Design a protein around this ligand. Structure first.
Ligand SMILES: [Cl-]
Ligand SMILES: [Cl-]
Ligand SMILES: [Cl-]
Ligand SMILES: [Cl-]
Ligand SMILES: [Cl-]
Ligand SMILES: [Mg+2]
Ligand SMILES: [Mg+2]
Ligand SMILES: [Mg+2]
Ligand SMILES: [Mg+2]
Ligand SMILES: [Mg+2]
Lengths: 370, 370, 370, 370, 370
């Protein structure tokens, strides 16, 4: 539906296949003042950087990104992770950044800074995460892509992992995103068409520590750019359509070295225990509005837990935490936190998990350290 | 007609020609709780599997696929056949699966499990099947593709194996499907435009034993993915348009080693005999609604048998079973069961043929064994 | 204008460029019960046939092609000529066939069978034919392609061999057909935009004996397939638009070894003589409705002969037979029969020429032989 | 949506307001061989008939209306009820007819003939009926009028007796029909928007005896003519949209003189008793397919009775028969048979009610009389 | 569909309702050189003529109407019948004319002149005619009005005397025409929707002698003017759509004083006898191409006689002549000639009936008289 999507793409293609020369493009990516939106810009480099360390710091105007007031508005980008650019091909790069203010302090929405620290504190336990990112394809009118105009498709049931024109809306986006990620070097585990038509999932992982946040964010950025090409919107809102229509969540898989090795199930249950005593804290960390967004998703019905009550169970689709059936069988593996909203900050989610399960914190606020 | 079909396909193409790296995509395919619909999803692998045995088991939510109730909804995928992915190219794969419940028992629609067994019991007789899969191309409105809006093309006659814009609607699907099959390694024997405009056939075979089911199902899946690309629907309904318009059937060719070698015609007639005493049982097995769907097709008129009466004949287009003229000439070969509906499960059809013709069963229910 | 022509062709292209493997596709082509229409279907082969002789016989349902009654409807295809498939590329093939009934007798419209014989009877005289196939491009509404909606372009005059957007309608079809033919191995001599806009010609020849029919027919098939891709219709009707608008004919060039060598003009005049005595018989053979179709073309006006009167002349555009001016100059060469309708069967036209000019038959019916 | 609906209506209007002169138009209306469809034609009269008795008999071709075989196809129309023509205004007339064969026997779908008799037999008891005719407005594509294209509006709830653009689809039809009926002299009691959007009701009654059928049928004809003008279709099908969408029924109110006068409730319960013993017979008479159509409506859910089980209750929306709450209060009035399909023949419904309740018949077939 | 039909009709209306003054418009109508088309033009008069006799003769250019050669092209209009103008209202007039050449001889297509004479010769026998004029409504593309684009509606059966949007295409034309006729003073007997959708009939009669031709012709003219306003075309072609679709005829009813009075059936059979001996002559007179047009309608199938064979019968829908069942009953009345094509000249049809049945002519050419 978007106007730019109707421009002649063959023309872009023609320019895109000009041999580019020795110079190299770097697209810097970062997180908005909203804690949800991504921004980016591009600079030329003199040659292909061999790793993230070779990339210059950069800056931008924070008052144009909901990130500062008048006089001291300038803000700083510090390269954190680097990937191959699937939009421009090699030698070009995507550069995920951290955001700092003028006084070189982390920005309000720079959650990576603190999370990176917390992950270093527990590196010997080798924490691994996986995330199931759900999203919904929308036209520029805000109506789900490929839904009848001002209407509803038929009821849920045929669309989950569906195939065929009447079943799966917008697969091209999925397919393209998937390769884009592979090429970029993102740890994309797979994908499926979700329960609501025009709703899809991709899985990212397994990722060690800080890597989880980095990979999910960049995957998200790639999804936006791909959607942008096709002229549609990806929405990470946890409940895009009110009523009998699936919400979107961000299921998180977690395991330590302990949990993965034999009889790890013991440690799994131990951390589930600590979690049960910190439900309220985790909901606060599981979406950028402190739990207000997730409230519309976590209702009990439609295979969700209630936002108010903690619960756990082996192969329990309706619980706050699920231990996979076969994880229960072999008494080792990982568990799944089904609480995080589709629009959560993965840095916020992974940090909270470590704090509660591994550094045994309690109270209503994150302990500060050395 | 579909909205996704109007997205810019050149854009998908751009991404699809990124070099993918060491990782590999596997699309798992399975059968719905409807016994008619296919589902699928994709996971990443670390390298190209060398055969179906190297592929992990997987699971999915059965309550989203008409396949279970609340609490123990999780279900299991066991790789059964592997093919090259024509939608993603090498090294990627299609993985046809069997479906099992949480208690590791076959799902209601997993007819492969039992059919596999029965096929093993007779492997020395080397049973070979061929199936003629008929289908109709529909727009997203449910009207046959390329038919006049709310209307009818001219009467049947010019469309069977027709050529020209006024004669063959939607050949592109046919052409693409055919290659997709070849590349995938599906045993596609040929194809033709059928009697009703927008209606087509492909032939799968000859296939030994369990292979028949596997090949036809995956062929079907491929057809759906291809149609999906083009924005149309493939319908396997046995009578998509009421009245003077061809139904869609799934003619099945059958032969044993005995029947193929000299004077096999004797054995052909012997099994036709056994079949004549079990019409009612076969009708039950020849469509997923026990014969209610086929009732709309098998009416006697339009070169179909009557659903009520068994009949056989040499080169008899109107009979339940047809012995090909030249099979009658050379007194060896195969016979054609013209009864199965275009939407039958090939596992159910092939099994019923073995049970009646080879294991000489009678009665109203399949014998159980060792 | 056709609906299928609006499908995304890039998508077909993607599938069509999958490497196909060892298997090979053969499209069998044949003639309708109408004696005008072409039919076809496709089977897989295990490897590339090295010549027409390596191709299996086949069958189809004659009651679906205006070719038989109820009970014994099955009919037989016997490979006659093979070409490379320009729609699928090497190693794939087009297989022009002859049609036989269940009792292995020639079908009513299988005119090749008898023509083949008659051509063998005179092979020492090396008869050579060339045919000028005229045709008109039509939209799916039946109005000539690129004509004004419910209207007429400006009057004839600027279109014959015209160039420019306001002059030549539908050249892409012509261009593609031409190459398709070349690749196939069809003996295509050339082409031109004809007098009526959206009307074109291609020339086939020179062809020895039976080859003429085979080449023209397959050329026609190719034209229909090409038009099919583009979404338009090729019509061979001799008078597609009533009134001051050119008819379409199938001018036939003929020569024997005798006529080609020095002072052959003598033999040319001799056969023209025999022809003058058999006008009525020839008109019957020059269109599939015994002369009813040609009646609408051959009116005397618009550089046509009258259907009632035979005439001949050196460089005479308005005559039944034309001796090219330069054939008259050098007293050797060929003559042009300007009588055949654009929709004639070339087998019927070539046979009739041999019979009258070479086997000196007279009477109202073809002599039977050994 | 219909093409004729897009013609310039102001032009018709211009002609329609020419003063017509002394002559008068009579439109004869009758029932199809389908028992569901209505037919009509118009003849000129020399002056305004003063009552139904003054109107000539007429005929038509029964083979064109699903009503006879070859040779003796002519059929007869006998004027039965007359109304003022709301499409043409005074002095013009609508003339509802009975249909007879060439041998002056009633036609198969002429149920009025026998019903008229049965009504005469009980005239002293003054039977009064009321019918609640439900129907759905459809576009010419067969999709409910004003529904999203290939889609569904939001769920039921806001549409029953709704007001506003997003609530009541197609009220113009309702409004016009209502006046049309009033003008015609039809006994139209009222109307409402029904539960499913684009679904409406009008009530006809109270009508004495044979009058019920006459008035409902003519009301139906008027509805079709009005819908015709607007370009939409009225459908009397009992279950136009499968699933969670209201069926359409034809609730029938019934009372005798006995039931209306004080303590009539006794007689009401007496006839409900007789009815309870003849459910099966009544289902047969409550739709033209003997109960096959109603089977899709009467499922128990969505405030319907089950087609299999008889039931009765005071103010019971889910029962086969309902005694209005206030009829139960005052111990006199009428009861409501909720079983008849929206596409029933009122003649068949009213006759069956008389036969069971008043002439105390039992058995499986209507008693014949004098 | 026509461009003029899309002009703002309300604007015409504004002008049309200016009070016109003392002057009066007369539209003269006449028959083309084709014997099928009608022409007209308009002159102002000083006051309302009181009858046809007060109207001036007039002239027009016959070379512009297919009616003469170069030098003496002028032709003459002689007022024959006058009617009120339903397009302009009172005091304005339609004036049907006879056409004469410069030498005051009747024009080739002026069949009225001779017919008038023949009618005078038998006036004492008071011959009465009725004609059933069938016609088809077409869009400006030549496709039947309201049919699917390049397609066909569903099969015949529901359309004869149909009501509802999906049944009766273009009723507004019918309705307007009917009133137009009434107002003009045309003897319009009635109308009905015919078997083929978009096909309609109106009946004209009974008319004495020359009056028949006058009334039918003027009715036809009115139909063209009305269709013109609505932007569609009325076609009187006897077979507008090839194949399984009803032809259009012009059934003619005939009776003399003798036949109408008691035991007239004797005379009816007498004239049917004379007719049986002159089939060939009548076919020549029953369409303007001497029978070539009717050849496409009269085929035996679809309730038509064969063009080759005469036949008669009581209530025989498939015969050349039908005696109505009730005419056979009461042994008096009229008979119906079902042979005339919908495009016949009524003057030619009525004259031929008189000549054969009343002036007992035989031979192949009309006797000349005094
Ligand atoms: Cl940028
Ligand atoms: Cl997937
Ligand atoms: Cl094919
Ligand atoms: Cl009417
Ligand atoms: Cl005028
Ligand atoms: Mg999920
Ligand atoms: Mg077939
Ligand atoms: Mg030429
Ligand atoms: Mg109601
Ligand atoms: Mg008629």
């Amino acid at each position: 539906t978007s106007a730019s999507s109707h421009l002649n793409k063959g023309i872009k293609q023609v320019y895109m296949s000009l041999p580019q020369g020795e110079k190299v493009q770097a697209m810097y990516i970062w997180i908005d003042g909203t804690g949800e939106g991504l921004r980016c810009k591009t600079r030329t480099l003199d040659s292909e950087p061999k790793g993230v360390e070779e990339l210059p710091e950069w800056n931008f105007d924070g008052s144009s990104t909901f990130q500062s007031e008048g006089s001291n508005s300038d803000m700083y980008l510090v390269p954190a992770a680097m990937f191959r650019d699937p939009f421009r091909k090699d030698p070009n790069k995507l550069v995920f950044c951290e955001v700092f203010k003028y006084n070189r302090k982390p920005a309000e929405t720079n959650l990576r800074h603190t999370c990176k620290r917390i992950m270093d504190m527990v590196s010997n336990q080798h924490p691994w995460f996986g995330m199931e990112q759900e999203y919904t394809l929308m036209g520029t009118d805000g109506h789900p892509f490929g839904w009848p105009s001002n209407g509803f498709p038929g009821p849920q049931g045929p669309y989950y992992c569906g195939v065929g024109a009447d079943k799966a809306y917008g697969r091209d986006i999925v397919e393209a995103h998937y390769r884009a990620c592979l090429y970029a070097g993102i740890k994309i585990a797979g994908t499926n068409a979700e329960v609501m038509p025009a709703q899809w999932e991709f899985q990212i992982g397994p990722c060690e520590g800080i890597d989880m946040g980095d990979h999910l964010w960049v995957a998200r950025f790639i999804l936006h750019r791909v959607c942008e090409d096709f002229g549609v919107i990806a929405t990470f809102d946890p409940k895009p359509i009110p009523g009998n229509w699936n919400g979107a969540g961000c299921h998180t898989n977690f395991s330590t070295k302990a949990m993965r090795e034999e009889n790890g199930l013991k440690y799994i249950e131990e951390s589930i225990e600590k979690l049960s005593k910190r439900h309220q804290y985790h909901i606060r960390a599981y979406d950028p509005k402190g739990g207000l967004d997730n409230a519309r998703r976590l209702t009990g019905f439609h295979e969700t837990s209630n936002i108010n009550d903690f619960s756990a169970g082996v192969a329990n689709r309706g619980a706050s935490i699920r231990i996979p059936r076969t994880v229960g069988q072999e008494k080792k593996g990982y568990f799944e936190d089904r609480r995080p909203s589709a629009n959560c900050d993965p840095f916020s989610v992974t940090e909270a998990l470590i704090r509660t399960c591994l550094l045994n914190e309690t109270g209503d606020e994150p302990f500060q350290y050395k």
